[model samples]
Every structure is written in C-alpha cells, then in structure tokens.
Target: SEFGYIYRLAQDYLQSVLQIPQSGPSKTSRVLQNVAFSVQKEVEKNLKSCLDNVNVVSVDTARTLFNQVMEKEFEDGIINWGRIVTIFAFEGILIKKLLRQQIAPDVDTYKEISYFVAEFIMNNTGEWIRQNGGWENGFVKKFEPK
Candidate 1:
C-alpha cells in the first residue's frame, strides 16, 4: 500500500487546506489523477506556477527529469506544506509535458509514471512525514486555510 500511503496524505491535505469534498473515488478517474488534480489546484491557489517544458528523450529520461526537479526543491529533509504542495504541483506540470510529447501518451505509460511519483514522494519524505508532527500538526497547523 505504499502507493496509497502518500495519496492518503494528499486526500487529507485537499480536505483540510483546500476544503475540497472527497465525494469518494470514481471508476472514471485514477487515484493519482485525483490526488494530482487536488494538489495541482491547491498550489495554484497558493500562487505556485511554472514553465516546465521538458526536452524528453526517452521514458527512462522522463522518469529522471521529474525527480530531478522534485528532490532539489524537497531538499535537506526540510518538510512543510508549501514544499509538498510545490513538489506535487511541479509533478503535474512535468507529467503534462510528457503527455504532450507522447512520452507518456497511453494509460499504461501513464500508470507507471504515477507509480514512480508516488514512490518518489514516500521514498524521499516518508519518515519525515512521521517525525515532524505528522501531517495534522505539521501541515494543518502551519498552512490550513485561514
């Protein structure tokens, strides 16, 4: 359930910070897309935007560049809602770039990329999420809407 773990956090995040209703899951949308949609919008509300046009050469490089941007911003184990929101938002932007160029132009290709991103987030920040007051005290306390 490693994939679901980070996404669970995303679900709670959307509700707490953005006040978005869960309304449960749907057959029409994938989990990553749901989480991505919420985080993507939340970042824009917080005024996070970017031009992430990637020069993708191959699928391998596609994975590489996505994290290339994430880890740098999520650097030093310094965790916060702003950083997580920015990282997740950047992910959506990069994913769109890949889809546009046909790098991840199919459901199958898209799934793995989502899996990679889910894993990358936990691999990089799982323990930190646990240690630093968990999601509620850490993120909610810091940046839950006003």
Candidate 2:
C-alpha cells in the first residue's frame, strides 16, 4: 500500500485475471488493498496465533502450509460474505509471516510467496469475485462494520 509486497502482487494479477484495467489503481484495487489495511491488525493478532509456535521451515514451507490450512479453514463451505472476510484475513496472515522473514527467510522468497498466494486466490475465486461485482459492490459495503 498501504502494506507491502504481497498486496500489490495479488492485486496486479487480480487485474489481469478479472480482466479489469491493466493500467492503474481502480475502485477494485483500492477496495482489495483496504481489506488488508483495515483488517490486518486483527488478522495478524488473531490468525497468526493459530499456527504452532515453531520454525515453519522456509518460504516454500510457509506457502504450502498456508494453503494447507486454507483447505481446512472452512468445512463444507461455499463462498459467502463471511467466508470472503475470513479468506482476506488469512491472506493477511500469510503476508505478515513472509514480511517478518522468520518462516520466509529472504526477500526473494518473500517475492515468490507474494505471487504464489496471489495466483492461488484468482484461481480459487477470481470468477466468483468478478461475479460478486469486483469488490466495490459486493465487498466494500459489507466489509465496514455496522
């Protein structure tokens, strides 16, 4: 950003995958970025605690482990508003972990995991998000607390 590496990395690929403007920030990108900003502290404080307190090995280890827990993040779930929020939170967790370079260990490793999770998202939800109206309509409104 607002934040750093992974946020931009994901948003860039999101632009292409969702087939939005390839040029600059849009309503879509800003909304996505803010999900990390507004909710990051909560996600970091809470979600980061879910993993065991130990060396998670390396960037590759953390990356796959992030994906693995993601599979278990929900049960019999279909995408919905709350689920979307949950996903955003864990994405923040992964980014935060890489940033500290504990599990991740290097700048280049950090870079790879950025695009790595970015790719995972679009594949998992690109079409769903676009149809959900690309963050502004379906996302930005409800993301704000009541």
Candidate 3:
C-alpha cells in the first residue's frame, strides 16, 4: 500500500480541485496547443527561488536535482509522498485557475509543469518524505550513470 496513500491523494485532488467525475476520460480535454509556454512562465514565476538557472533547465539537471532533493528530504533515501502529492495538486489547481482565465492547456503543458515540479521540489529539499519511498533504490538501477 505504499502507493495507495499517494493514489488516494491524487483521487481527492481530482475530485475536489479539478471536479473530475469518476469513470471519465483518462486525460483532460480542453486542449490548448501553446499552453506549455504559459505553464513554463508560470513555473518560472512560482519556482524562482529554487531554480539555479530557470531559463536553461535540462531534463538531466531536473532529474539530478530531484534525486538530490530526495536524498536530502527523505531520511530513508526515497521520495516523499505528501510532498509530491502537494506539488502535483498545486499544479492541478494552477491549471484550474488558468482555465478560469480562459487558458486551455495541452498535455505538453502538463509535462513541462511536471519538470518544473521536480526542480521546485529539488530546490526546496527538506523533510517531506516521512514514509513514501523513491524509485532510485530499484527503478533507476538498470541505467548506469554517464
């Protein structure tokens, strides 16, 4: 049940914040092709304190930072469920707010925001990983570091 807690939190966010009904489409529909640009801007604004170089963040940097933060926050050397849940929930809220402002976001926008979330958490690294574990112990084992 490690994932159960996070899964429940996700369900709650979807129902309460996004008002998504059960048994619906897997993804949100209100498509906005260029929404990634806006999401990037929003991420930069919200996570200015965490990012070392907001304008030029690569996936490797983001992943490294995320792992580093995980190491710092979780004494168990894993990820924090509450922290990740909160990060994702807030992003969903942000998207809802954007929808209210008539800003529709596409899947790519969400992807960009996900990276931003990783970087944001990395920058703010602290004790959120009370129980939930990260994937590094097993998930990232197959690929050797370059």
lDDT tens string, model 1, 12-35?
333333334666543212333444
Off by over 4 Å in 2: 1-24, 52-54, 140-146
What's each prediction's TM-score?
A: 0.60, 0.62, 0.30
1 or 2: which has the higher TM-score? 2
Residue by residue across 1-146, what tens digits does model 2's lDDT show?
21333356464533433345655775555655566445556656675556656345676767777677666764465666555555555555554555554643654554565566656556666667678865666676666444
Give residue 22's error in model 1 in angstroms. Answer: 11
Better structure of 1 and 3 per lDDT: 1
Using lDDT as the yardstick, the better of models 2 and 3 is 2
Best-to-worst lDDT order: 2, 1, 3
| 10 residues in a row with least lDDT, candidate 1 | 25-34
TM-score, structure 1 vs. true: 0.60
Worst 10 residues of 2 by lDDT: 1-10
Give per-residue lDDT, candidate 1, residue 36: 48
- lDDT of all predictions, in order shown? 0.56, 0.57, 0.40
Residue 84 deviation, candidate 3, in Å?
Answer: 3.5
Q: Highest lDDT, which number?
A: 2
- Itemize residue pairs with steric clashes in candidate 3: 79-134
Model 2 root mean square deviation, Cα atoms = 7.2
For each candidate, how many residue pairs have backbone atoms clashing (under 3 Å)? 0, 0, 1
